[PDB]
Write a protein that binds this DNA or RNA. Structure first.
Lengths: 52, 83, 82
DNA sequence: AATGTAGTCTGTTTTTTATGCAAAATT
DNA sequence: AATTTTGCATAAAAAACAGACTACATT
């Protein structure tokens, strides 16, 4: 149901740098917002990038 | 069939086997205590040199191609005096 | 100098040639596991040879390799060497 | 403007390690 | 018979990991 930041991004129409995808999470650009479980983020498989 | 092969062509594993076969022949009673590291360093450095040459110095792509953390790549490059 | 293969060129030269050939065959293919791929090709012969030298003695094989015995039985189990 | 990278950091999880010990196997 | 090896359990150190963030580059 949930993917890593790397898995989520690899599945995107235009995958970006992991550094870029993290900035997005930090900037509240991912909806629903990924939760940090220990060292990693967990994206719901349906999560999208939003235009702010 | 095999993806890592050397020039008739043969697997890279066959070249390692032969390199160690020679080592044990030229081992006239020596005590060995670091064989893993010795083989690892002999195989890690040309892998790091070839991938960095391939990515044209791009550390992020080299690490992504290697399947290792970027911080881990940087440490191995420092270990072999490459960065 | 210490790990060499017959005409006698070193082993790092055989790794370099294998990767040169590999990158050449990457026909649009997206690489993701190159470190493990190289490591598994190098680990199976090393484990085969060291165990052949120690006549199946894992205690001596771990000492020769400079690793812990647990780490050795783990690597062995991985390459189905049981 | 937005994305990509080197370099320098922090905190978390996973792997490797030393150690103890009993059973099994080798001497 | 005595000695070593093995299989397996811990706990801690070591390694690899994801991410944060800034300065500068590339798109």
């Amino acid at each position: 149901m949930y993917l890593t930041l790397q898995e989520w991004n690899a599945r995107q129409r235009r995958p970006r740098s992991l550094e870029t995808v993290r900035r997005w999470v930090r900037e509240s650009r991912i909806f629903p917002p990924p939760v940090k479980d220990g060292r990693e983020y967990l994206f719901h498989e349906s999560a999208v990038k939003v235009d702010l | 069939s095999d993806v890592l092969t050397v020039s008739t062509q043969k697997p890279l594993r066959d070249s390692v086997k032969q390199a160690l076969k020679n080592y044990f022949a030229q081992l006239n009673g020596q005590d060995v205590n670091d064989l893993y590291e010795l083989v690892l360093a002999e195989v890690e450095q040309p892998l790091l040199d070839m991938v960095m040459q391939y990515t044209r110095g791009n550390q992020t792509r080299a690490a992504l191609m290697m399947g290792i953390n970027r911080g881990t790549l940087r440490k191995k490059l420092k270990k072999y005096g490459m960065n």
